[PDB]
Design a protein around this ligand. Structure first.
Ligand SMILES: O=P(O)(O)OC[C@H]1O[C@@H](O)[C@H](O)[C@@H](O)[C@@H]1O
Ligand SMILES: O=P(O)(O)OC[C@H]1O[C@@H](O)[C@H](O)[C@@H](O)[C@@H]1O
Ligand SMILES: [Cl-]
Ligand SMILES: [Cl-]
Ligand SMILES: [Cl-]
Ligand SMILES: [Cl-]
Ligand SMILES: [Cl-]
Ligand SMILES: [Cl-]
Ligand SMILES: [Cl-]
Ligand SMILES: [Cl-]
Ligand SMILES: [Cl-]
Ligand SMILES: [Cl-]
Ligand SMILES: [Cl-]
Ligand SMILES: [Cl-]
Ligand SMILES: [Cl-]
Ligand SMILES: [Cl-]
Ligand SMILES: [Cl-]
Ligand SMILES: [Cl-]
Ligand SMILES: [Cl-]
Ligand SMILES: [Cl-]
Ligand SMILES: [Cl-]
Ligand SMILES: [Cl-]
Ligand SMILES: [Cl-]
Ligand SMILES: [Cl-]
Ligand SMILES: [Cl-]
Lengths: 502, 494, 502, 494
């Protein structure tokens, strides 16, 4: 039962050759997310039938075909809808052992690209290159310098694009210098600094729901909005890779990158055009007006063992350094300093080993005092990006029936209920958009700095030991102090119920 | 299934006696809507156990109990849950034959009433009297004068309330006269001028959805709203009851009353309080600012026989006068002259023998020009009061999937899907509210005036033969000219 | 150059007789404000030439004509245009000695009015009666009961109207009692509770400037207005009449009556019609939404002796009780609890023995953050009701000349510069409006209650000794704590007005 | 009086030499506006003491010094304060006779320029070169190609800037060609396209008054503004030189440039920053949304002799081609297609030989219907850029006195009454801003395009003879049809 592959290959891609180099092909991200996404884009018939996926990792691969069919293929998802195509697809993937420091190996990479670029039977004799750098931050600049030297495409004979994965430094100084390190190496246009939250279905609709509809457009200002809440929740802890996380922390890992992006699209002014840079310009413009996070206006947590004992404590990890104070949870109150968001509190929440898995945006409107008084409560527009993709506006309506009373209700749109479409993984969209050359869903340098500049002073205060990191039971709602702070920060509504929650 | 009726009748009605007189009990409205609604209020245990429903009509009855069990009872609805209660309920209804002009017959209705509240075993002496006047407009003032003479309750011994059914005159001059005819007879507080749309579940939420929510409150003005459309659609025509209709017409029958009612609620400013008098004050205030309908800003229709022939032509009715020009369909463009509704077009639609049964309100917001251009289209808040009571906001969203495209969608709330509750008939709410003394869902005299003053000049122009009445096939969408006029009036197809 | 008397007398006042009884005619208010205003209305040709002004006081005066020509007439103002008319006018005023408690003295009042109405050369045989009660609060109910008994006009022969003066109780309980005391005596329609601020030129334009202009109408809400300041300033102290003031205080004397009035017209929603009760209904409606003044949100003062010795201390008055803590100055922060004024601070200021004489309203708009930043500052619409009647909108504009800099400026309208008209005294308008039957510029009972209910809890706290009364030099800007509180309350702009002020 | 000139010349202009070449020094513009503005900037001590103004022209002078003190100097204005400085100033101006096409004369210009900066006694080597091209459009590209070849400052030895005067083509195609003709010759940064309207005191405050004030910011949208009127009025006609105007017309001469400029500033969204390009980006962005002027939505005029006869007819000029139909007057209704200006009419007026001299902007707000009705009328914010520099907001207030009546009033600010400062001529600011390198008050190439694209279809229709050109008496208000059109266009004559 497998759906056929139509020709959705964009006309640009089906004239010149194609080579998708996955640098760090053995690595966890590439096995789990990159290669699987490439399979789905192939199945969609969005990649040319004669595409060349080249795996460039350090691993001394004995049987490539076994790793391809057993390891790699084990991660492909729709198989009751596209299982037969696994064979034809895998035939396009080739592996190549090599180092991220020896120029002889990058030359050996240029060598292999051309040997498989020359084999193209199409109209243009050039060849296009997309390099996915899913490699450690420890070797990043090496590979960038190596690829820019001897792995580039001849002029008027194709494009070179680079998908740069995170981390992007620990702070603004760290990131700034890395951004300087790439300036000679590549033109910004070639760089595609990937944030995957810009590939999530609900995250993409932020710009449409906000600038296609007069209903939301007229309400998106300080006069109508009383509070804005961005929430990240994860049932899982670090559990295995706690050693890795210790050096990053909840703010650097999710808040600085993923949720500041949510924040940029939520707060930005209407773009001049729907152009990539026109959209990107407004994103940076608004983060340039975000006041840097102050330590007194935040709550930090670190998870301890669950009541059941099934989830262990954060520190109860051998990889986690003894006596660590790394925050696994954070709640922040941010302020956008412009005539649109003046006064409006921005409550950003993020935590691991919590009560539920959740990604949602909450635009809480002003309370309508008269004529309903206590019979009513703040309306809020809720956009849940995961688990069930949905958008719902919470209102106050008359209790249906033979009675003169009120009740809170929803004007819901549940994606799983209303659409028979099997929505793509964030990475399918991004990789595809990068092949097309759409720099919109990719972090711009200035946009990235604008983001680092918000958290760097807070991050430093935290690292200097100035900010207290409260303990909370794994699987609970989080520290008590946080829910109180959220109330003080300006958020209301009695819709926060678990056994723990209130 | 059959379960015990609870004694949840409001404590006001608990102390003294109760008598609900249905004048014109033989009549079509009473047997189809009044009596059935009274059964449901009894089953809810909202009426006292010992309530007295008295039928009073010109009709002579051989077997009242047969008419009660066969005619009357045949109209009761929930019978898979409430079927057993039909017996106990019917036991409360009594009938009496009488003229609507002979004072003796009135002295006879009162005597029955005296004796009923004389049999009460409760805390207070005397009784409460609610009179439902579901009788022709031809005998109305006769009964009002008669009841006010010898059928009233002595002071400090109970209340008398009058549920006055429509029609309320043929125009503003006719209605004025009638209201003056009732001024000495009864105090306005006693009068309960009934418009049944005010009892519809979705029509009631108009005030809450507008003034409890900041989302709709901030948008309810000329700056955000591009057009407002009130739609009445009926699959059925005049049928046998066409002679009666000829003298009334679609404007007088539905637009003037029911739809101007929705219009008042939709346009009114936030009430000072949620008080009866505070809510109604704003209703009149806004109809006082509605510009009277001009003949050039309207389209009229009259149905022809259907393609199948199953629905005969309007004119093909023996009761319908030869060569009549009575409109069975009307579309109007109204203008509210205040700084909230300045410019905003108000498209009111109403017609019989159309393509579907429909009652909906459409609040069409301004088109958001840039950056989406043609990739987007006017948002609309849609409140459908019937068939399926639902509220949905139409919106533009990204085509779900691996696409950079748009699609129109909505944010639904379908009352049938979301609530397990068997919603009441408009008349259950109204009759109940009238027993409690809630004058909110009842037309006020100035409110009635304010309404008549909108349509009277248009109605007269029509009756003078100044306005053309276009023909349309029964069961069709209506005349072509109407859809074109709606486009010109400011409404955008979607 | 004596401006002749035109027949601009309203048609109602023509047909039936007219009798204006001034109860307490010897009293300070009557001789200083009432009688002078009646002269000006006579001169304007607004009162019938055959009008009857009857002075009913306790004083046992010998030469009435001397008191008329020397005392009374000495207070008349325009005499370089209207000086000749003093004679003809004074001929209409007559005096009567009599108690405020003996009914025989009231019957004797009825008796004289009857003789006057019996001398009327006009169409109707009855006569109209306007009673100006400018008498102590100590005898008020006595006169009301006496007039209602035997001083009323026969049915279908003329109207009776009562101009009632301040004070209207000590608090809400005191006022309630008094209003109930008058309920059987007179119909509210007959009662004309006088507040003279509704008689001031700028105070009257509050309703026009707000509901005739789209410019101000669109801005009169929480989204555009950042703060509202009502200011009362008086260069003079209690001087001799410190005894009279000790029992009243600055809140009861000006904040409760005069400035809550200014406040009602500033905050009210657009009236249904321009009708008297349609206007009055919105006034009552908005004061019903004012949250009662809390003691922690206020500053109180009591004037000390001035540096120059010219103004002695408040307590340095023989009439002022020893060790009295009566506030001569008050600043409070009020909150209107409705969707229009939600969040908007209302700073009400009032004080005697201050730096300047001033009555002004300040509608301070939100600060426009970008693109001008510190180069700009909050715009504020200023309506000054006295000294110079003016209305001016403060705005930021480019420094005129060969410069790229900013400067604050005003779009002024000065009534003495622009209009070259001799504006009437507050009391001319009011007395005239009362003869016509315009209850608009008169306090309604619910409008009086709604006002008392704001200050009664604060007033009580003050009288219980719970609120601190700070000392301040006579002729200074007031206590230091007050200016700081105003800043904290939400009021801005760098007004370095005096040596003291900043 | 006569006091010392201070050395307040900007520190950038201090280090390196300065040469201001006025190409077309004989010309009417230079002798009347350029040279006089140069004198005032010198008197201000805004130009270095050792500045070099070089007049380059085809004309020949026997006595340059006579033309300098008698012709040139006769046009200098403040002489009761600055009259003594005429000498010292004139001592900086030098002249040269040269063709605007022969390369020898361009080598000969450069020759002078190097030698002048060779004589500089300051810190930096080389010198800065500002070229004011006040020459016919007939020789423009010839001088641009000639200057770009020869008289160019060597790199790292100073800047070269070009103040290019109008006209900028006669349509979008004409202008496009010309802009492409300059693309290789100079970088846009060097080009300074002058529209002197941008130097007028009130035109400059357009950006401050609408983005520094919350009062005007909150009102600057379709919800509050009912109509916007831009007016240019001139008491004088074409006079002696008309044939020259015949090829241009009122739309190309004033509207397309000057008034579309005001229009851009009035309609633009709040700039990202106060940067030169941040400001210029919003200007182009809004003209990119202006719908092109349609012929049916405009009125054209051509002045006829005055009743007095003092002003002769437009055609009664020998230079004016026989049977011409050139518009000397135009009134247009423009539409900005964005969610800020949706529906708002933009009435642009412009005419020569009219009743008065006038430049004003009129922002007419919506009429406030209730509770005042006819007792009130539309508020209007009026900015008058000439004759008397003033800004006044028109509003309704209670008739002062013993009255319950209304009257129209204004919250004036008259710059002549409020400030004792002798405001500079548009050209002083511009020339100064160009020496500093502030590209804000200068037309951008895309700005120029965006402007041309509005009027080019209308202009062509006019030139094809498709649009009627009505006659009007010189010195009158203009054609009757125009005032009627303005009323229909949405302007409610307050
Ligand atoms: O919307 P509803 O419940 O069908 O009510 C509309 C009814 O309105 C009444 O006025 C008419 O007599 C009916 O013919 C019509 O059907
Ligand atoms: O400077 P003013 O008086 O406002 O006039 C602007 C003038 O500017 C000139 O550049 C135009 O050629 C004229 O047509 C126009 O009249
Ligand atoms: Cl900043
Ligand atoms: Cl629900
Ligand atoms: Cl759904
Ligand atoms: Cl730091
Ligand atoms: Cl018609
Ligand atoms: Cl319309
Ligand atoms: Cl149904
Ligand atoms: Cl639903
Ligand atoms: Cl039904
Ligand atoms: Cl008529
Ligand atoms: Cl309340
Ligand atoms: Cl004064
Ligand atoms: Cl000033
Ligand atoms: Cl001034
Ligand atoms: Cl002035
Ligand atoms: Cl108390
Ligand atoms: Cl904006
Ligand atoms: Cl477009
Ligand atoms: Cl001038
Ligand atoms: Cl001039
Ligand atoms: Cl002025
Ligand atoms: Cl003037
Ligand atoms: Cl064309």
């Amino acid at each position: 039962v497998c759906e056929r592959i139509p020709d959705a290959v964009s006309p640009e891609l089906r004239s010149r050759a194609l080579t998708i180099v996955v640098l760090g092909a053995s690595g966890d991200l590439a096995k789990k997310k990159t290669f699987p996404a490439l399979f789905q884009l192939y199945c969609n018939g969005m990649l040319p039938r004669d595409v060349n996926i080249l795996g460039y990792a350090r691993s001394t691969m004995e049987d490539v075909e076994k790793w391809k069919k057993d390891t790699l293929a084990g991660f492909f998802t729709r198989l009751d809808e596209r299982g037969c195509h696994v064979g034809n697809f895998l035939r396009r993937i080739s592996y190549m052992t090599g180092s991220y420091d020896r120029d002889e190996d990058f030359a050996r990479l240029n060598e292999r690209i051309l040997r498989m670029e020359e084999a193209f039977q199409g109209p243009e004799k050039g060849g296009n290159r997309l390099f996915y750098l899913a490699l450690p931050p420890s070797v990043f600049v090496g590979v960038c310098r190596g690829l820019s030297k001897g792995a580039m495409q001849k002029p008027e004979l194709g494009w070179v694009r680079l998908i740069v994965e995170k981390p992007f430094g620990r702070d603004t100084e760290t990131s700034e210098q890395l951004s300087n390190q790439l300036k000679p190496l590549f033109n910004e246009r070639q760089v595609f600094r990937i944030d995957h939250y810009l590939g999530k279905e609900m995250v993409q609709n932020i710009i449409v729901t906000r600038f296609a509809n007069r209903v939301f457009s007229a309400l998106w200002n300080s006069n109508s909005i009383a509070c804005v809440q961005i929430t990240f929740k994860e049932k899982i802890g670090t559990e295995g890779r706690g050693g890795y996380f210790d050096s990053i922390g909840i703010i650097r890992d999710v808040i600085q990158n993923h949720l500041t992006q949510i924040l940029s699209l939520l707060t930005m002014e209407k773009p001049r055009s729907l152009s990539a840079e026109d959209i990107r310009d407004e994103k940076v413009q608004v983060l340039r007006q975000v006041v840097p996070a102050n330590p007194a206006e935040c709550v930090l947590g670190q998870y301890t063992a669950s009541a059941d004992g099934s989830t262990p404590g954060y520190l109860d990890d051998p990889s986690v350094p003894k006596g660590s104070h790394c925050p696994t949870f954070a709640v922040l109150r941010l302020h956008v300093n412009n005539d649109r968001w003046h006064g409006v509190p921005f409550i950003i929440r993020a935590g691991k080993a919590l009560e539920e898995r959740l990604l949602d945006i909450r635009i809480q409107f002003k309370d309508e005092i008269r004529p309903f008084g206590e019979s009513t409560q703040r309306n809020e527009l809720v956009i849940r990006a995961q688990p069930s993709e949905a958008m719902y506006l919470k209102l106050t309506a008359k209790t249906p029936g033979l009675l003169n009373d009120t009740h809170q209700t929803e004007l819901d749109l549940t994606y799983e209920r209303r659409y028979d479409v099997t929505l793509p993984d964030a990475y399918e969209s991004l990789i595809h958009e990068a092949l097309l050359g759409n720099s919109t869903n990719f972090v711009r340098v200035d946009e990235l700095d604008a983001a680092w500049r918000i958290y760097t002073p807070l991050l430093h205060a935290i690292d200097r030991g100035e900010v207290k990191v409260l303990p909370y039971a794994a699987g609970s709602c989080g520290p008590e102090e946080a829910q109180e702070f959220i109330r003080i920060s300006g958020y209301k509504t009695t819709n926060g119920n678990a056994y723990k929650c209130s």
